[PDB]
């Protein structure tokens, strides 16, 4: 389990997400939405 | 020269002494009857020696003078090919 | 954990250093300054120079000329080369070039000593190194001397001559000037590098350039092999110089400081010197004189031009020409207006808005400075008798100074002034010592000095230091400036010409990747802090480690925990004899047996296999590795 | 340990290039381009995808700029001012000079020719210069404290740059636009074998190798006098920065032969300050350049002209250098809506004219157009799309992906038509990975990041002191203090609980034979089949191969059957095991 430790250490240290990421829909998002 | 050679690398002091005093008989030639001589007293120094670099220094001498003029080198590697079994 | 030093010149410094798997040149060097030991090559054959009185020895005498006391030899110049024959340079690896000044002499190692290694440099320092060559060969095969001159070279006979000539060293190790074909050859294997450019050298060791501040590409090399790092400090400077200043942050966490190039005449202030030269010129200038400026083509004569180019303004004296004669004249002039990004933050912001950086081009534009190829082009139509040249090699053993010398010293109105520090005034000086002409030494050396070095030693805090032994002592002029010395908390160990220093950076623990398929397949452990066991196969390519996948052991089972906690796991009939420190517990199936001796554990078998495995499995319930 | 990489712009277009890159955690803008041809609205990327009424700057630690182009840097000062980022923005010295000129045309074209209500001012553009970091070429900057970047040689313009951004054992090159075929005054792309998790290539020519450099130069030559021997004009429109420097050295030396002075109608002081900007960045030119410029200066041109008038002239052999490129606005749209004729009004496009009207329809007829007064052409009329552009071909891609070799590949600033065409190729070819992705198409990878250990050097020597010819390396890491740390198990008990276990067994002998039989004859037992035991020869008479020894004591001591003891660890079990069960009953009398 070497590589669970590691990887989880290494995700537990990271940053915010995009907001399109996060409202995405198959890994697409409309851009533009406004218009 | 051959005894004095033998004698001044007998007292120079082992790290850097003797490895200038074997810079300095590395330019000036030698005659090819007396290799035999001088390369006899490098190998027991080179047995004497514990300094790598002096012993780097001897192997790369006694390698120069390998390439003087019509002497023949067949005499002189069993004893090189000894000390580079044990080197 | 080894360095050959193959130069005790400490600013031409050539060291090679068996770190790791690859042996590093670091720099190349020429000592130029056994140049002047000999006379000088004029453009035009003199009459003093030719008629010059004979040594006189009990014996020769057509060899050794002598001029006011001093004894030169009627030869061509030779230059001292570093130590070639201390290590086969066929083994060496790497070369790395910080300096163009300590870039000469890179024409013998790669031609005539059988090295097929890379050359690493920054390209301001390939080309102007190119210009220096180019115009050493220029001057030496400009009006060529034969080199008769070998009876002196003799070890007995070197000893009964003067100072200057007796304290040489390294005599039958000199050599002439290389060709141009050497030149051509030796700046073809060379790699272009800018500054932090990781290279790998064959995966073993990361190699970067980082600027110096010093010159035009000059740059400080950092060596590391991911865990062990060697710092190499050549000339630098921590002035307002146009170059982008020092990157001192780099050096930090070094196991090896490496230290060269260091200021010559410490106790001169850079800025003083500038305007002490600036108003000596002027003065001569003023009384109708004129004025020879033995410079580099691309030293520091950019800098006393643009103090110069301030200067005359103010003073009154923008009528005066401002010459400068060289063979690479314009190609220096170019090179230095065109690297522009190689500049400090002040000067490279002169890219944005369009203007060149330097502003010698002004002075070109308003015809105030004229650079010419040589004497008998143009110069001699253009030239105007109050005038200042710069021109030919410092060294006054050759280029066109020799002439300026010969024409101008009859008279006390003209002056030299020196402005290169790397060679003795008074030495360089000696063929035309019975001159009338007015000789100024101002030197201008913005290399370190003994405050700064101490300072960036404290701010960086490198464990070892190497420098010349030069600086480990004060210097002979003074010889009693405690000021004048590398002062560090570790003793600084020092090295002379040919010496090899063992140093005592070897360090274990080389880094090796673990690829994520075995790391699936280990697991760590708790003991008393995290550990694991790995059994794999090793693979290496290019010297870079790869764990692919595919005695000790350590607890806590003392004899009480022992008796107690596995005394009914799935055996039966065991009995426990009292043996001192320990006990001994045996079973009576097959005389099977367990001995414990202090902090260890063994299984006896008698006769039986099946058994055997679990009983060693029912003590690693908790054994561990450690 | 997934590198996600959105394009928000040129996905499947050209123009607007905007590609963000999560790698590590760290977020990386690519370019910051602006689209052209758009009239509102879509001229910028949507930033609104980086969770918009909110500090960009948080999000945003690296934003990289790949040449001075108006479609990878023109929405770069509305963005960092406008937005609000203030990190930082890394381009290369020739791109930090010559992108705010290229800005401050275009909002002098918005402010004049167009609206300019929602667009940005000079001061404006000033204001984004502060935060712009200089990187020079090869200059492994450190951004932050484990995301690194790498600037290498594009080719496509002065200062172009594919921008390597390593963090870790994670890599993703970006190669901006570049050329693989060097010009008359910049050289071809390189880049050494970083062989990166993904590339990041351009696609704006999928299309094969466009006929080498001699032929086109001698076709754009000949059709150039073909249009003067008539005494038509020539009206080719160019952004005066980018292929413009090759096509007027080219019709130079071509008019060298009639000796005709010919009008480069961009500005006095930007074709001035062109010069300039090539002469003080001469080390990013060609090497025929780099060695050349001290004997001459071939950006001196000895033919120019200011503006307006001479345009307006007599119909003569005059060939025009308009000022904005693409025909989408400016002295290029102003000339061509005048100008009209067989031999006359030659159109030279050496551009791709992504999406601007008018430009864009060289595959057209060029006849159509869609303006309030439209005009119409001719055949002779030239409208031929000469291909003068700096950008790589097929052959050059594939070149590129080659020499980079990289573990996947991506595709931007191209067609959508030419980019499924080049995926095919390289997947069909190469066998890596391709991807396809739109505009706010999110693309996520797999990592597979090593783990960086450190192995003691004994241990490391040891590994092939026996193992270099069948082998094996055992060990035991010890995860102390935060770092990984492999070590053999002796400097394992060295680091800091010891309690040894071993095999030392004494196995009842099945053989009952004499003393001789049962010492001197068990013990050769080794060398019958088995394999990677080590070899050392005593004269006394002793197997010793690691942890083993046999020659214990008397044949029988203990009052029952023959007793010796066998020894082994847990390494060299096989040889004890084997010897321990042909022990217990396979040696009978
Ligand atoms: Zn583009
Ligand atoms: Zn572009």
Same mark, same amino acid.
């Given at each position: 389990?070497?590589?669970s ?5 290494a ?9 399109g ?5 198959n890994?697409?998002?409309?851009l533009?939405?406004?218009l | ?8 690398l007998?007292?120079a ?6 490895l200038?005093? %074997? !810079?300095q008989?590395?330019r000036?030639?030698?005659e090819?009857?007396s ?6 007293? /490098? ?19 006694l390698? %120069? !003078?390998?390439k003087?003029?019509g ?10 090919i000894?000390i /580079?079994?044990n080197? | ?6 130069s ?12 790791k ?5 670091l720099?190349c060097?020429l000592?130029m300054?056994?140049?002047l ?10 009459p003093?120079?030719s008629?010059?009185?004979?040594w ?5 005498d057509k ?5 006011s006391?001093?004894v030169?030899?009627?030869s ?7 130590e070639?024959?201390?290590?086969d ?5 790497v070369?790395?070039?910080?300096n ?7 024409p013998?190692?790669?031609e ?14 390939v080309q102007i190194?190119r210009l220096?060559?180019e115009?050493?060969?220029?001057f030496?095969?400009?009006v060529?001397?034969?080199q008769?001159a070998?009876?002196?070279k ?10 200057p ?7 039958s ?13 030796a ?6 590098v800018?500054?932090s ?9 990361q ?5 110096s501040?010093?010159?035009?590409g000059?740059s400080?090399?950092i060596?590391?092999?991911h865990y062990?790092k060697?710092?190499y ?10 170059p982008?200043?020092?990157?001192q942050?780099?050096?930090?966490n ?6 060269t190039?260091?200021t ?6 850079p800025d003083?010197?500038?305007g002490?030269?600036?108003s ?9 004189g004129?004025?020879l ?12 031009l643009?103090?110069?180019?301030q200067?005359?303004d103010?003073?009154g004296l923008?009528?005066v020409?401002?010459y ?5 004249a ?6 230095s ?10 000067k490279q ?6 203007e ?5 081009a002004?002075?070109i ?12 082009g ?11 040249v710069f ?8 280029g ?19 402005t ?15 001159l009338?002409?007015?000789c ?7 290399r370190?000095?003994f405050?700064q ?5 404290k701010?960086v805090?490198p464990l ?6 030069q ?13 004048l010395?590398?002062?560090?908390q ?12 063992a140093l005592?950076?070897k360090r ?15 697991v760590?452990?708790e ?9 794999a196969?090793?693979?290496?390519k290019?010297?870079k ?7 000790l052991?350590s ?6 925990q ?12 065991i ?32 006769n ?8 060693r499995?029912?003590v690693?319930?908790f054994?561990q590795?450690? | 340990?997934?590198?996600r ?5 040129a996905?499947?277009?050209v123009?607007?290039?905007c590609?963000?890159?999560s ?7 690519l ?8 009239n509102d609205?879509?001229?910028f ?9 909110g ?8 934003v990289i ?32 000079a010559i ?5 401050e ?11 300019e ?12 210069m ?24 594009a ?12 963090v ?5 090159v970006?190669t901006?636009?570049?050329n693989?075929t ?15 998790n ?7 020519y999928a ?9 086109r ?6 059709k150039?006098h ?6 038509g ?7 005066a ?7 007027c ?5 071509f008019w060298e032969?009639?000796?005709?002075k010919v ?6 002081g930007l ?13 990013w030119?060609?090497?025929?350049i780099?060695?050349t410029?001290?004997?001459?200066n071939?950006f ?6 200011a ?5 307006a ?5 005059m060939v ?7 025909l989408?606005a ?7 809506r005048?100008w009209?004729?067989?031999e006359?009004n ?14 864009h329809?060289?595959l057209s007829?060029?006849?159509?157009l ?15 799309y000469?291909?003068?552009?700096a950008?790589?071909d097929?052959?050059?891609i594939?070149?590129?992906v ?12 191209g ?9 095919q190729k ?5 066998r890596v ?11 996520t990878?797999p ?8 192995i003691?050097?004994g ?10 010819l069948?082998r ?7 995860m102390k203090?935060?770092?990984?740390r ?14 040894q276990?071993?095999f ?10 004499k003393e001789?039989?049962?010492a001197?004859?068990?013990?050769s ?13 005593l004269?006394?008479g ?5 942890s ?7 044949p029988?001591?203990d ?8 020894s ?18 396979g040696?009978?009398?």
């Amino acid at each position: 389990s070497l590589w669970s430790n590691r990887i989880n250490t290494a995700n537990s240290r990271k940053h915010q997400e995009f907001a399109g990421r996060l409202n995405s829909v198959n890994n697409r998002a409309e851009l533009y939405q406004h218009l | 020269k051959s005894a004095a050679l033998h004698i001044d690398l007998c007292k120079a002091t082992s790290p850097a002494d003797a490895l200038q005093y %074997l !810079l300095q008989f590395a330019r000036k030639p030698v005659e090819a009857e007396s290799v035999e001589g001088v390369v006899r007293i /490098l190998l027991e120094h080179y047995y004497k020696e514990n300094d790598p670099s002096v012993r780097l220094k001897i192997a790369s001498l006694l390698g %120069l !003078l390998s390439k003087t003029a019509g002497f023949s080198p067949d005499c002189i590697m069993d004893d090189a090919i000894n000390i /580079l079994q044990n080197e | 954990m080894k360095l050959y030093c193959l130069s005790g010149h400490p600013t031409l410094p050539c060291n090679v250093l068996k770190f790791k798997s690859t042996t590093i040149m670091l720099d190349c060097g020429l000592d130029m300054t056994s140049t002047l030991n000999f006379l000088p090559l004029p453009l035009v054959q003199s009459p003093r120079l030719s008629n010059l009185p004979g040594w006189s020895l009990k014996d020769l005498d057509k060899e050794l000329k002598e001029c006011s006391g001093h004894v030169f030899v009627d030869s061509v110049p030779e230059f001292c080369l570093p130590e070639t024959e201390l290590i086969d340079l066929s083994t060496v690896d790497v070369i790395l070039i910080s300096n163009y000044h300590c870039m000469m002499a890179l024409p013998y190692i790669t031609e005539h000593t059988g090295f097929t290694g890379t050359v690493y440099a920054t390209e301001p320092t390939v080309q102007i190194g190119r210009l220096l060559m180019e115009e050493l060969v220029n001057f030496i095969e400009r009006v060529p001397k034969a080199q008769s001159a070998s009876l002196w070279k003799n070890k007995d006979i070197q000893r009964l001559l003067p100072s200057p000539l007796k304290d040489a060293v390294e005599v039958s190790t000199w050599r002439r000037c290389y060709t141009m074909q050497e030149v051509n050859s030796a700046l073809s294997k060379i790699q272009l590098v800018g500054y932090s450019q990781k290279i790998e050298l064959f995966g073993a060791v990361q190699v970067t350039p980082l600027s110096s501040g010093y010159a035009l590409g000059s740059s400080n090399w950092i060596i590391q092999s991911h865990y062990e790092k060697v710092s190499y400090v050549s000339g630098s400077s921590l002035l307002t110089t146009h170059p982008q200043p020092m990157d001192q942050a780099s050096l930090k966490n070094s196991d090896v400081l490496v230290l060269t190039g260091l200021t010559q005449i410490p106790t001169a202030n850079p800025d003083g010197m500038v305007g002490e030269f600036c108003s000596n010129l002027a003065l001569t200038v003023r009384n109708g004189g004129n004025v020879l400026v033995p410079c580099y083509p691309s030293g520091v004569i950019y800098d006393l031009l643009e103090c110069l180019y301030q200067y005359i303004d103010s003073a009154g004296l923008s009528s005066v020409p401002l010459y400068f004669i060289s063979p690479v004249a314009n190609s220096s002039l170019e090179f230095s207006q065109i690297f522009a990004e190689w500049l400090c933050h002040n000067k490279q912001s002169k890219v944005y808005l369009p203007e060149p950086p330097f502003p010698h081009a002004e002075l070109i534009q308003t015809n105030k400075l004229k650079h010419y190829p040589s004497i008998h082009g143009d110069f001699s139509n253009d030239f105007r008798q109050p005038c200042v040249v710069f021109t030919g090699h410092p060294s006054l053993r050759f280029g066109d100074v020799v002439h300026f010398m010969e024409l101008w010293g009859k008279s006390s109105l003209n002056t030299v002034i020196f402005t290169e520090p790397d060679f003795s005034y008074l030495e360089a000086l000696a063929p035309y010592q019975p001159l009338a002409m007015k000789c100024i030494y101002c030197p201008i050396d913005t290399r370190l000095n003994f405050i700064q070095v101490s300072k960036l030693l404290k701010e960086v805090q490198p464990l070892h230091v190497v420098c010349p032994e030069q600086y480990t002592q004060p210097p002979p002029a003074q010889s009693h400036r405690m000021d004048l010395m590398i002062d560090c908390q570790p003793p600084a160990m020092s090295y002379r010409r040919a010496e090899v220093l063992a140093l005592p950076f070897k360090r274990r623990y080389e880094k090796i990747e673990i690829m994520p398929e075995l790391a699936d397949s280990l697991v760590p452990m708790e003991i008393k802090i995290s550990l694991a066991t790995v059994s794999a196969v090793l693979h290496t390519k290019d010297n870079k480690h790869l764990l692919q996948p595919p005695p000790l052991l350590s607890g806590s089972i003392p004899v009480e925990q022992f008796v107690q906690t596995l005394e009914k796991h799935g055996f039966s009939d065991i009995k426990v004899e009292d043996t001192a420190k320990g006990h001994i517990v045996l079973l009576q199936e097959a005389e099977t047996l367990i001995q414990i001796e202090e902090d260890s554990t063994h299984i006896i078998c008698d006769n039986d296999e099946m058994l055997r495995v679990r009983l060693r499995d029912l003590v690693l319930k908790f054994l561990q590795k450690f | 340990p997934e590198i996600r990489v959105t394009p928000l712009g040129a996905g499947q277009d050209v123009g607007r290039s905007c590609i963000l890159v999560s790698i590590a955690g760290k977020n990386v803008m690519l370019d910051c381009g602006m689209h052209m041809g758009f009239n509102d609205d879509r001229r910028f990327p949507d930033f609104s995808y980086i969770t918009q009424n909110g500090r960009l700057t948080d999000f945003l630690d690296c934003v990289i700029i790949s040449h001075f182009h108006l479609d990878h840097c023109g929405a770069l000062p509305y963005f960092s001012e406008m937005v609000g980022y203030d990190g930082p923005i890394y381009m290369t010295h020739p791109t930090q000079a010559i992108c705010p000129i290229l800005l401050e045309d275009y909002r002098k074209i918005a402010v004049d020719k167009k609206g300019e209500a929602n667009f940005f001012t000079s001061q404006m553009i000033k204001d984004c210069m502060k935060k712009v970091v200089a990187v020079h070429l090869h200059q492994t900057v450190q951004v932050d404290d484990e995301l690194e970047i790498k600037a290498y040689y594009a080719g496509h313009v002065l200062g172009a740059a594919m921008f390597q951004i390593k963090v870790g054992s994670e890599s993703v090159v970006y190669t901006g636009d570049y050329n693989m075929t060097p010009d008359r005054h910049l050289g071809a792309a390189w880049i050494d074998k970083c062989r990166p998790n993904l590339l990041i290539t351009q696609s704006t020519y999928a299309t094969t190798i466009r006929d080498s450099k001699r032929c086109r130069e001698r076709d754009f030559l000949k059709k150039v006098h073909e249009t003067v021997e008539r005494g038509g004009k020539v009206l080719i429109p160019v952004f005066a920065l980018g292929r413009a420097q090759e096509l007027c050295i080219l019709l130079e030396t071509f008019w060298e032969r009639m000796n005709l002075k010919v009008p480069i109608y961009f500005s006095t002081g930007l074709t001035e300050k062109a010069n300039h900007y090539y002469k003080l960045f001469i080390p990013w030119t060609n090497q025929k350049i780099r060695k050349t410029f001290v004997q001459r200066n071939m950006f001196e041109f000895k033919h120019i002209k200011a503006f307006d008038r001479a345009f307006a002239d007599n119909p003569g052999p005059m060939v025009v250098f308009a000022t904005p490129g693409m025909l989408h606005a400016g002295q290029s749209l102003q000339i061509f809506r005048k100008w009209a004729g067989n031999e006359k009004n030659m159109v030279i496009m050496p551009g791709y004219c992504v999406q601007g009207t008018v430009g864009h329809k060289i595959l057209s007829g060029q006849r159509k157009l869609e303006m309030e007064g439209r005009q119409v052409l001719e055949v002779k009329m030239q409208v031929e799309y000469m291909s003068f552009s700096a950008h790589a071909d097929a052959k050059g891609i594939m070149q590129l992906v080659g020499q980079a070799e990289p573990e996947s590949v991506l595709l931007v600033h191209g067609e959508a038509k030419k980019m499924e065409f080049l995926k095919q190729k390289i997947e069909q070819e190469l066998r890596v990975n391709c991807y396809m992705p739109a505009n706010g198409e999110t693309v996520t990878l797999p990592t597979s990041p090593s783990i960086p250990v450190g192995i003691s050097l004994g241990l490391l020597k040891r590994e092939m002191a026996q193992g270099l010819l069948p082998r094996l390396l055992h060990g035991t890491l010890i995860m102390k203090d935060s770092n990984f740390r492999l070590v053999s198990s002796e400097q394992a008990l060295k680091e800091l609980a010891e309690h040894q276990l071993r095999f030392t067994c004494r196995v009842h002998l099945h053989d009952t034979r004499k003393e001789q039989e049962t010492a001197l004859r068990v013990y050769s037992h080794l060398k019958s089949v088995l394999k990677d035991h080590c070899v050392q020869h005593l004269p006394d008479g002793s197997v010793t191969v690691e942890s083993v020894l046999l020659q214990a004591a008397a044949p029988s001591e203990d009052p029952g059957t023959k007793v010796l003891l066998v020894s082994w660890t847990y390494q060299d079990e096989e040889l004890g095991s084997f010897l321990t069960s042909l022990l217990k009953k396979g040696l009978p009398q």
